[PDB]
Design a protein around this ligand. Structure first.
Ligand SMILES: NS(=O)(=O)c1ccc(-n2ccn(-c3ccc(F)cc3F)c2=O)cc1
Ligand SMILES: [Zn+2]
Length: 257
């Protein structure tokens, strides 16, 4: 199956998922001088005070923290969005080196990692229905650069050793995703897709201008995870990012001037 190696990586995905060559694929390069300020964009509404995290999981492509989405507890609204989006999970994409790892780029600049907070539109009832809809999902993307540590990330870092290999998971309650957010909610937004299979074109992307900073020790912790399952040849989980895809007939809008 698909992965990120020479023989199963992003250049191969279109064979199993032909939408990979579609009209609204993600990620993209965010060209900051071509993004147009839109004063009709509302401020983004991030309500995470009642978030209930459940589990943390190595799924062989990344690591994922899953939340209770059976109620409106951690929801995303406003910005470019209509209606209510519940937080289902967050995961990251990162590099083998600090100069690469993010999926979106900013004037071709790659960041060391990128956080995806994944939300689905409550009008569609469940995430499986939502992925079948052009406005089904809203993913909040946050870039990570290497510098000072992010204290709010450390509880995540600390448990990765218990989910080293694909298929392992741990109980992971009371994690507060507000500790992963930068100061500013200024954002870029464009219509796009999941950046892993099935690459469905269902996502309103909301990408924050301001990165968070993480420490070299924190990012190294990511790089010690494995793509493989245990008892199998060790392949470090690094460079699990899709490169930028053709923008085609899309305009990226900025919420800030
Ligand atoms: N890399 S990203 O654009 O943040 C991204 C990529 C893929 C997903 N993803 C993949 C499968 N699913 C999924 C989960 C539950 C379900 F019922 C159906 C799905 F397609 C999903 O949400 C979610 C987020
Ligand atoms: Zn992602």
């Amino acid at each position: 199956h698909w992965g990120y190696g020479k023989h199963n990586g992003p250049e191969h995905w279109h064979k199993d998922f032909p939408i990979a060559k579609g009209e609204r694929q993600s990620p993209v390069d965010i060209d900051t001088h071509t993004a147009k300020y839109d004063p009709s964009l509302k401020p983004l509404s991030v309500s995470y005070d009642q978030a209930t995290s459940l589990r943390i999981l190595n799924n062989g492509h990344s690591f994922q923290v899953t939340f209770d989405d059976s109620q409106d507890k951690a929801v995303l609204k406003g910005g470019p969005l209509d209606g209510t989006y519940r937080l289902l999970q967050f995961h990251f994409h990162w590099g083998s080196l600090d100069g690469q790892g993010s999926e979106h780029t900013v004037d071709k600049k790659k960041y060391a990692a990128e956080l995806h907070l994944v939300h689905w539109n409550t009008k569609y009832g469940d995430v499986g229905k939502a992925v079948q809809q052009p406005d089904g999902l809203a993913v909040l993307g946050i870039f990570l650069k290497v510098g000072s540590a992010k204290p709010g990330l450390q509880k995540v870092v600390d448990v990765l050793d218990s989910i080293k290999t694909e298929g392992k998971s741990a109980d992971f309650t009371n994690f507060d995703p507000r500790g992963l957010l930068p100061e500013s909610l200024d954002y870029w937004t464009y219509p796009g897709s999941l950046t892993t299979p099935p690459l469905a074109e269902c996502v309103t992307w909301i990408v924050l201008k301001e990165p968070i900073s993480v420490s070299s020790e924190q990012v190294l912790k990511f790089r010690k995870l494995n793509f493989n399952g245990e008892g199998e040849p060790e392949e470090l989980m690094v460079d699990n990012w899709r490169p930028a895809q053709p923008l085609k007939n899309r305009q990226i809008k900025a919420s800030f001037k």
